[PDB]
């Protein structure tokens, strides 16, 4: 295994180093506004060295943005595809590339057989070529790598089945900045090349000057280079026709033949395209070939890529004709005039890359190596696209909840083969496809119109119900004596209980377990653990009595704690935000111990009085002028007091101190240690009253944030043996700090209400001497070092926080893990900050056509880990990566893949069993089974199950942590007959494994295996 910590890779371009050296000056470069006047030696190309030009027709089809997916399909995409089929069939030299498989599958299944066969023919002959082949062209900032793989697999599995092709070249022309997680996943999925477009205009200029726009993109920790993927970065401001033929859009726009008037389009540079004729073809060719030769100066080979397309292009038949005929006339002229020394033709993306690599093999070019990312993107001036790291945070959090539900449903149901009548494959395909659709670069990004966001939310709600159905049917089958099991596949044997989604204060949707002497004495509950190691974790349920005790299925008592159910209300009468306790339901909390990838059953039983193994939390309401808070049968009376500082400690864990406003002030790790200043604060950013306005995409603050005025907020302290908390009702945020014995959990119920032009940020202030350095993750896969640059504006120092961020000095580290992607930064030494929500009245001129005024309450979740790190083996100062400790990684897993909870719905569960998976191997803490998916339906004689295994890299800090079992996924199901290593999409077999044993992977590596069973 490669060492991902101690060996600094030697690369030609390292993006953090490049950023430190770059000046980022925004000067007028002439017709190429953000470049320079390109010059070329006309004698560079001659009869023996011609410029080979591939014009690649394309149509960017957003799966929802200004219209829903189905609205665009009906108005535009179905016509684009039907006309592409007709025009390509009739014009054999014409070509077209297609990226979004969600639309292609929607179209193809509506075709008659005659057309399906014609379509397969133009794909097989190479005229219509799929690029990337994912369900969507995903966002690369907020998306989790597991969902990027899910959607790539959904589209490519569909393509292999119906079109018999698997793309090896990727096309990503629109995500707003680019992540190295993409080449990581693509290179492990058979890809050989990729293309990107939205990178900072200053980066395009810098790399263009050094002819470093094509590079071998490797991961930041990859010393050897085995993760490298050839990457082409386009050079100009847009992927539209005016910015793809060459440096001068006033000239290129004249070669977009859809802009002459009848289509309702024009050229903003005021010179319209003109129909090519025999009397103007020589002059038109001389203008066009000159743009091509200028663009070719920015690259190292004599093979030039010229994309020809834009949003929802190639719809009407007249448009296919106007572009095709005019370009055919230009090609016939240019290719016949030796003096140009050009051979131009329509081509596909793969054809371009194959020709570039033929040039490379002929020794005509060597390509530079590069590592790093391409965030934060700016397309012009100070317009940095860091707003979409937070926009529509409700749905960003929903994405992570559905991510987990899809994994758990696919894993729980994979253990068995299911009859078709159970509709298991049907519900899983629906869930995978709705979650995959939301990875679109206007879905999770929060950049679609309000009714489109509603469509995505409705689709995800249906996917969550599909997952619950599959999960609960699986649990009933796995835990019921086989000869008693009698399923009704439409019945709800269990309901899922989720404590953090939508969340307390967001939706009252959790069911109360109703017990009573005259109705039902007890209730079985089951926990599932999708991670491949034993896990203990506190779980909670709502119950109708405080006198409840817990037992495991061997009837062993389990210690429990009961607390009230508190809800916060904005009292319009008193103009205060305060808590009300339920007088009819209570929370019971206890530790569940669940096997690796397994299930554990517990029983909740009511009694007439306080049971022996259940304790009751105390509750203290701090506010002046308190009023009574009755709690029904709860046995401890609520206590009251004036606001005051307080300290809490659960178990042997840390001791946390809080201000009189209910916000953390310090953390003391152990009895002896110091009380380390760690202060939470809420602040607000505004919008500029002159100049450019923030919107769904852009973050353009009107200076540093200002503190939210807190008033004298009401603070609620609940102190229990197993779980304690401090909750405070602040303006727009009910902030909670929860302690269960280790790193605290923070929950924010964020309701920005009607505060227009406001962004609410949560900041942590510490005295960690971090300087200008901080770390943020990329797609939940890796942590990259960031350096705050005062030469760039505040919004440029904001980065995606898809799952965590940290700051550290020689001795101390503070890590903040998240349960949802949000934007954040470290704007001063010792600080961390993460945006909670933003409400913006204005459109930001990127096409959305509205502000962001559809905010809704969202429950954001986090874990806060303060640790000593002076004994940890960390990368050297020049290494561009950082790595989590064991505790921070486990805290992240606690947020993203919690135990699932099931409440048996009926009164008695006949044949109930107490555990499943007790014999599953408990793997090393850094290894995860990211995906377990049965790949065959019940009629297959040889069943196949796919596994994706991911091993992260945790810092060595002197904590032995030993005795773990080897995990061989190929023997998890019985009767294995074959074990193969495959690409991550499971579509290609790479290695037949000896002994049918799937070896574990190296740190920072991800591998896929398929086991076959007889
Ligand atoms: O190339 C045309 C450009 N496309 C914008 C892309 N980014 C946001 C969406 O995903 C859209 O595809 C545009 C289209 C419409 C209005 C403004 C700009
Ligand atoms: C699928 O593509 C392969 C290319 O290697 C070809 O050999 C195979 O026959 C194709 N299957 C069909 C006919 O769909
Ligand atoms: Zn787009």
PDB file of C-alpha atoms in Angstrom, residues 230-420:
ATOM      1  CA  UNK A 230      -6.161  12.525 -18.282  1.00  0.00           C
ATOM      2  CA  UNK A 231      -8.189  15.729 -18.013  1.00  0.00           C
ATOM      3  CA  UNK A 232      -9.008  18.440 -20.536  1.00  0.00           C
ATOM      4  CA  UNK A 233      -9.973  21.848 -19.151  1.00  0.00           C
ATOM      5  CA  UNK A 234     -11.753  24.098 -21.674  1.00  0.00           C
ATOM      6  CA  UNK A 235     -10.175  27.582 -21.816  1.00  0.00           C
ATOM      7  CA  UNK A 236     -12.862  30.113 -22.092  1.00  0.00           C
ATOM      8  CA  UNK A 237     -15.698  31.690 -20.181  1.00  0.00           C
ATOM      9  CA  UNK A 238     -18.537  29.428 -21.310  1.00  0.00           C
ATOM     10  CA  UNK A 239     -19.313  26.176 -23.119  1.00  0.00           C
ATOM     11  CA  UNK A 240     -21.705  28.104 -25.518  1.00  0.00           C
ATOM     12  CA  UNK A 241     -20.792  28.514 -29.190  1.00  0.00           C
ATOM     13  CA  UNK A 242     -19.463  32.102 -28.800  1.00  0.00           C
ATOM     14  CA  UNK A 243     -16.915  30.809 -26.252  1.00  0.00           C
ATOM     15  CA  UNK A 244     -15.910  27.556 -27.870  1.00  0.00           C
ATOM     16  CA  UNK A 245     -14.624  28.276 -31.366  1.00  0.00           C
ATOM     17  CA  UNK A 246     -11.745  30.510 -30.304  1.00  0.00           C
ATOM     18  CA  UNK A 247     -10.897  33.534 -28.154  1.00  0.00           C
ATOM     19  CA  UNK A 248     -13.123  36.126 -29.769  1.00  0.00           C
ATOM     20  CA  UNK A 249     -16.835  35.677 -29.028  1.00  0.00           C
ATOM     21  CA  UNK A 250     -17.819  38.428 -31.494  1.00  0.00           C
ATOM     22  CA  UNK A 251     -16.426  36.179 -34.243  1.00  0.00           C
ATOM     23  CA  UNK A 252     -17.504  32.783 -32.810  1.00  0.00           C
ATOM     24  CA  UNK A 253     -21.072  33.952 -32.347  1.00  0.00           C
ATOM     25  CA  UNK A 254     -21.230  34.310 -36.131  1.00  0.00           C
ATOM     26  CA  UNK A 255     -20.819  30.523 -36.370  1.00  0.00           C
ATOM     27  CA  UNK A 256     -23.829  29.756 -34.146  1.00  0.00           C
ATOM     28  CA  UNK A 257     -26.319  29.413 -37.021  1.00  0.00           C
ATOM     29  CA  UNK A 258     -29.289  29.412 -34.690  1.00  0.00           C
ATOM     30  CA  UNK A 259     -28.718  33.137 -34.059  1.00  0.00           C
ATOM     31  CA  UNK A 260     -29.862  34.794 -37.344  1.00  0.00           C
ATOM     32  CA  UNK A 261     -33.419  35.854 -36.111  1.00  0.00           C
ATOM     33  CA  UNK A 262     -36.255  33.351 -36.889  1.00  0.00           C
ATOM     34  CA  UNK A 263     -35.353  31.432 -33.706  1.00  0.00           C
ATOM     35  CA  UNK A 264     -35.619  34.489 -31.526  1.00  0.00           C
ATOM     36  CA  UNK A 265     -31.873  34.588 -30.869  1.00  0.00           C
ATOM     37  CA  UNK A 266     -29.160  37.109 -31.700  1.00  0.00           C
ATOM     38  CA  UNK A 267     -25.440  37.827 -31.066  1.00  0.00           C
ATOM     39  CA  UNK A 268     -24.808  40.309 -28.224  1.00  0.00           C
ATOM     40  CA  UNK A 269     -21.627  41.441 -29.972  1.00  0.00           C
ATOM     41  CA  UNK A 270     -23.874  42.788 -32.730  1.00  0.00           C
ATOM     42  CA  UNK A 271     -22.543  40.932 -35.741  1.00  0.00           C
ATOM     43  CA  UNK A 272     -24.964  38.194 -36.808  1.00  0.00           C
ATOM     44  CA  UNK A 273     -24.149  34.823 -38.294  1.00  0.00           C
ATOM     45  CA  UNK A 274     -24.472  34.718 -42.087  1.00  0.00           C
ATOM     46  CA  UNK A 275     -25.494  31.780 -44.195  1.00  0.00           C
ATOM     47  CA  UNK A 276     -22.413  30.216 -45.809  1.00  0.00           C
ATOM     48  CA  UNK A 277     -22.394  30.471 -49.628  1.00  0.00           C
ATOM     49  CA  UNK A 278     -19.897  30.037 -52.374  1.00  0.00           C
ATOM     50  CA  UNK A 279     -19.308  33.902 -52.404  1.00  0.00           C
ATOM     51  CA  UNK A 280     -18.499  34.181 -48.738  1.00  0.00           C
ATOM     52  CA  UNK A 281     -17.118  30.728 -47.773  1.00  0.00           C
ATOM     53  CA  UNK A 282     -13.500  31.727 -48.296  1.00  0.00           C
ATOM     54  CA  UNK A 283     -13.797  34.818 -46.093  1.00  0.00           C
ATOM     55  CA  UNK A 284     -15.900  33.016 -43.492  1.00  0.00           C
ATOM     56  CA  UNK A 285     -13.356  30.146 -43.445  1.00  0.00           C
ATOM     57  CA  UNK A 286     -10.472  32.537 -42.962  1.00  0.00           C
ATOM     58  CA  UNK A 287     -12.147  34.059 -39.889  1.00  0.00           C
ATOM     59  CA  UNK A 288     -13.047  30.683 -38.456  1.00  0.00           C
ATOM     60  CA  UNK A 289      -9.756  28.931 -39.091  1.00  0.00           C
ATOM     61  CA  UNK A 290      -7.954  31.920 -37.507  1.00  0.00           C
ATOM     62  CA  UNK A 291     -10.038  31.435 -34.283  1.00  0.00           C
ATOM     63  CA  UNK A 292      -9.247  27.708 -34.342  1.00  0.00           C
ATOM     64  CA  UNK A 293      -5.507  28.293 -34.721  1.00  0.00           C
ATOM     65  CA  UNK A 294      -5.546  30.760 -31.850  1.00  0.00           C
ATOM     66  CA  UNK A 295      -7.377  28.235 -29.614  1.00  0.00           C
ATOM     67  CA  UNK A 296      -4.885  25.546 -30.710  1.00  0.00           C
ATOM     68  CA  UNK A 297      -2.021  27.674 -29.344  1.00  0.00           C
ATOM     69  CA  UNK A 298      -3.263  26.941 -25.832  1.00  0.00           C
ATOM     70  CA  UNK A 299      -2.768  23.182 -26.191  1.00  0.00           C
ATOM     71  CA  UNK A 300       0.109  20.812 -26.908  1.00  0.00           C
ATOM     72  CA  UNK A 301      -1.061  18.646 -29.785  1.00  0.00           C
ATOM     73  CA  UNK A 302      -2.285  19.251 -33.338  1.00  0.00           C
ATOM     74  CA  UNK A 303      -5.713  17.872 -32.435  1.00  0.00           C
ATOM     75  CA  UNK A 304      -8.292  20.561 -31.493  1.00  0.00           C
ATOM     76  CA  UNK A 305     -11.630  20.139 -29.687  1.00  0.00           C
ATOM     77  CA  UNK A 306     -14.426  22.511 -30.770  1.00  0.00           C
ATOM     78  CA  UNK A 307     -17.682  21.849 -28.865  1.00  0.00           C
ATOM     79  CA  UNK A 308     -20.772  23.031 -30.825  1.00  0.00           C
ATOM     80  CA  UNK A 309     -23.821  23.418 -28.545  1.00  0.00           C
ATOM     81  CA  UNK A 310     -25.633  25.134 -25.700  1.00  0.00           C
ATOM     82  CA  UNK A 311     -28.614  24.589 -23.365  1.00  0.00           C
ATOM     83  CA  UNK A 312     -31.366  22.446 -24.926  1.00  0.00           C
ATOM     84  CA  UNK A 313     -29.945  22.876 -28.402  1.00  0.00           C
ATOM     85  CA  UNK A 314     -30.679  20.738 -31.464  1.00  0.00           C
ATOM     86  CA  UNK A 315     -34.429  20.696 -30.932  1.00  0.00           C
ATOM     87  CA  UNK A 316     -36.069  21.738 -34.169  1.00  0.00           C
ATOM     88  CA  UNK A 317     -35.434  20.131 -37.531  1.00  0.00           C
ATOM     89  CA  UNK A 318     -34.666  23.581 -38.986  1.00  0.00           C
ATOM     90  CA  UNK A 319     -31.973  24.023 -36.312  1.00  0.00           C
ATOM     91  CA  UNK A 320     -30.338  20.662 -37.118  1.00  0.00           C
ATOM     92  CA  UNK A 321     -30.272  21.735 -40.755  1.00  0.00           C
ATOM     93  CA  UNK A 322     -29.003  25.257 -40.236  1.00  0.00           C
ATOM     94  CA  UNK A 323     -26.043  24.121 -38.156  1.00  0.00           C
ATOM     95  CA  UNK A 324     -25.223  20.995 -40.202  1.00  0.00           C
ATOM     96  CA  UNK A 325     -25.424  22.482 -43.697  1.00  0.00           C
ATOM     97  CA  UNK A 326     -23.444  25.593 -42.863  1.00  0.00           C
ATOM     98  CA  UNK A 327     -20.698  23.609 -41.166  1.00  0.00           C
ATOM     99  CA  UNK A 328     -20.569  21.056 -44.032  1.00  0.00           C
ATOM    100  CA  UNK A 329     -19.926  23.974 -46.450  1.00  0.00           C
ATOM    101  CA  UNK A 330     -17.141  25.313 -44.237  1.00  0.00           C
ATOM    102  CA  UNK A 331     -15.519  21.852 -43.911  1.00  0.00           C
ATOM    103  CA  UNK A 332     -15.629  21.187 -47.676  1.00  0.00           C
ATOM    104  CA  UNK A 333     -13.933  24.543 -48.362  1.00  0.00           C
ATOM    105  CA  UNK A 334     -11.395  24.445 -45.566  1.00  0.00           C
ATOM    106  CA  UNK A 335     -10.363  20.819 -46.114  1.00  0.00           C
ATOM    107  CA  UNK A 336      -9.839  21.471 -49.840  1.00  0.00           C
ATOM    108  CA  UNK A 337      -7.702  24.581 -49.432  1.00  0.00           C
ATOM    109  CA  UNK A 338      -4.186  23.361 -48.712  1.00  0.00           C
ATOM    110  CA  UNK A 339      -3.003  26.758 -47.488  1.00  0.00           C
ATOM    111  CA  UNK A 340      -5.035  26.315 -44.273  1.00  0.00           C
ATOM    112  CA  UNK A 341      -3.365  22.956 -43.501  1.00  0.00           C
ATOM    113  CA  UNK A 342      -6.504  21.930 -41.600  1.00  0.00           C
ATOM    114  CA  UNK A 343      -8.663  18.780 -41.697  1.00  0.00           C
ATOM    115  CA  UNK A 344     -11.981  19.563 -39.926  1.00  0.00           C
ATOM    116  CA  UNK A 345     -14.968  17.333 -39.281  1.00  0.00           C
ATOM    117  CA  UNK A 346     -17.826  16.571 -36.935  1.00  0.00           C
ATOM    118  CA  UNK A 347     -16.600  14.245 -34.217  1.00  0.00           C
ATOM    119  CA  UNK A 348     -17.360  12.827 -30.796  1.00  0.00           C
ATOM    120  CA  UNK A 349     -15.517  13.320 -27.494  1.00  0.00           C
ATOM    121  CA  UNK A 350     -13.899   9.882 -27.558  1.00  0.00           C
ATOM    122  CA  UNK A 351     -12.655  10.575 -31.093  1.00  0.00           C
ATOM    123  CA  UNK A 352     -10.953  13.738 -29.884  1.00  0.00           C
ATOM    124  CA  UNK A 353      -9.246  12.002 -26.975  1.00  0.00           C
ATOM    125  CA  UNK A 354      -8.187   9.019 -29.094  1.00  0.00           C
ATOM    126  CA  UNK A 355      -6.499  11.419 -31.537  1.00  0.00           C
ATOM    127  CA  UNK A 356      -4.817  13.381 -28.748  1.00  0.00           C
ATOM    128  CA  UNK A 357      -3.324  10.175 -27.323  1.00  0.00           C
ATOM    129  CA  UNK A 358      -2.207   9.004 -30.794  1.00  0.00           C
ATOM    130  CA  UNK A 359      -0.298  12.357 -31.007  1.00  0.00           C
ATOM    131  CA  UNK A 360       1.163  11.776 -27.548  1.00  0.00           C
ATOM    132  CA  UNK A 361       2.312   8.255 -28.500  1.00  0.00           C
ATOM    133  CA  UNK A 362       3.871   9.693 -31.680  1.00  0.00           C
ATOM    134  CA  UNK A 363       6.024  11.765 -29.300  1.00  0.00           C
ATOM    135  CA  UNK A 364       4.456  15.046 -30.192  1.00  0.00           C
ATOM    136  CA  UNK A 365       3.501  16.083 -26.631  1.00  0.00           C
ATOM    137  CA  UNK A 366       4.082  15.204 -22.964  1.00  0.00           C
ATOM    138  CA  UNK A 367       1.459  16.225 -20.444  1.00  0.00           C
ATOM    139  CA  UNK A 368       1.951  17.760 -16.994  1.00  0.00           C
ATOM    140  CA  UNK A 369       0.760  16.157 -13.759  1.00  0.00           C
ATOM    141  CA  UNK A 370      -1.630  18.022 -11.471  1.00  0.00           C
ATOM    142  CA  UNK A 371      -3.232  17.602  -8.079  1.00  0.00           C
ATOM    143  CA  UNK A 372      -5.728  19.735  -6.168  1.00  0.00           C
ATOM    144  CA  UNK A 373      -9.294  20.984  -6.723  1.00  0.00           C
ATOM    145  CA  UNK A 374     -11.019  23.806  -8.587  1.00  0.00           C
ATOM    146  CA  UNK A 375     -13.030  25.504  -5.887  1.00  0.00           C
ATOM    147  CA  UNK A 376     -14.098  28.234  -5.374  1.00  0.00           C
ATOM    148  CA  UNK A 377     -15.150  29.108  -8.875  1.00  0.00           C
ATOM    149  CA  UNK A 378     -15.537  32.654 -10.153  1.00  0.00           C
ATOM    150  CA  UNK A 379     -16.696  33.275 -13.702  1.00  0.00           C
ATOM    151  CA  UNK A 380     -15.924  37.040 -13.679  1.00  0.00           C
ATOM    152  CA  UNK A 381     -14.619  39.789 -11.374  1.00  0.00           C
ATOM    153  CA  UNK A 382     -15.448  39.085  -7.700  1.00  0.00           C
ATOM    154  CA  UNK A 383     -18.473  36.874  -8.532  1.00  0.00           C
ATOM    155  CA  UNK A 384     -17.497  33.716  -6.576  1.00  0.00           C
ATOM    156  CA  UNK A 385     -20.015  30.878  -6.590  1.00  0.00           C
ATOM    157  CA  UNK A 386     -19.946  30.020  -2.909  1.00  0.00           C
ATOM    158  CA  UNK A 387     -23.611  30.806  -2.228  1.00  0.00           C
ATOM    159  CA  UNK A 388     -24.827  27.444  -3.606  1.00  0.00           C
ATOM    160  CA  UNK A 389     -22.755  25.670  -0.949  1.00  0.00           C
ATOM    161  CA  UNK A 390     -25.701  26.621   1.341  1.00  0.00           C
ATOM    162  CA  UNK A 391     -28.748  27.474  -0.796  1.00  0.00           C
ATOM    163  CA  UNK A 392     -31.897  25.478   0.032  1.00  0.00           C
ATOM    164  CA  UNK A 393     -30.353  23.761   3.045  1.00  0.00           C
ATOM    165  CA  UNK A 394     -33.475  21.764   3.851  1.00  0.00           C
ATOM    166  CA  UNK A 395     -32.912  19.698   0.720  1.00  0.00           C
ATOM    167  CA  UNK A 396     -29.149  19.492   1.252  1.00  0.00           C
ATOM    168  CA  UNK A 397     -29.897  17.838   4.596  1.00  0.00           C
ATOM    169  CA  UNK A 398     -32.604  15.639   2.976  1.00  0.00           C
ATOM    170  CA  UNK A 399     -29.969  14.405   0.500  1.00  0.00           C
ATOM    171  CA  UNK A 400     -27.878  12.969   3.310  1.00  0.00           C
ATOM    172  CA  UNK A 401     -30.840  11.336   5.003  1.00  0.00           C
ATOM    173  CA  UNK A 402     -31.924   9.670   1.729  1.00  0.00           C
ATOM    174  CA  UNK A 403     -28.270   8.703   1.027  1.00  0.00           C
ATOM    175  CA  UNK A 404     -28.325   6.613   4.159  1.00  0.00           C
ATOM    176  CA  UNK A 405     -31.822   5.190   3.656  1.00  0.00           C
ATOM    177  CA  UNK A 406     -30.911   3.998   0.168  1.00  0.00           C
ATOM    178  CA  UNK A 407     -27.750   2.262   1.522  1.00  0.00           C
ATOM    179  CA  UNK A 408     -29.714   0.667   4.365  1.00  0.00           C
ATOM    180  CA  UNK A 409     -32.582  -0.514   2.122  1.00  0.00           C
ATOM    181  CA  UNK A 410     -30.224  -2.013  -0.441  1.00  0.00           C
ATOM    182  CA  UNK A 411     -28.152  -3.717   2.263  1.00  0.00           C
ATOM    183  CA  UNK A 412     -31.068  -5.074   4.373  1.00  0.00           C
ATOM    184  CA  UNK A 413     -32.800  -6.518   1.334  1.00  0.00           C
ATOM    185  CA  UNK A 414     -29.641  -7.930  -0.237  1.00  0.00           C
ATOM    186  CA  UNK A 415     -29.448 -10.786   2.267  1.00  0.00           C
ATOM    187  CA  UNK A 416     -32.273 -12.607   0.517  1.00  0.00           C
ATOM    188  CA  UNK A 417     -33.664 -13.219  -2.930  1.00  0.00           C
ATOM    189  CA  UNK A 418     -37.211 -11.778  -3.186  1.00  0.00           C
ATOM    190  CA  UNK A 419     -40.171 -12.851  -5.170  1.00  0.00           C
ATOM    191  CA  UNK A 420     -41.215 -10.342  -7.806  1.00  0.00           C
TER     192      UNK A 420
END
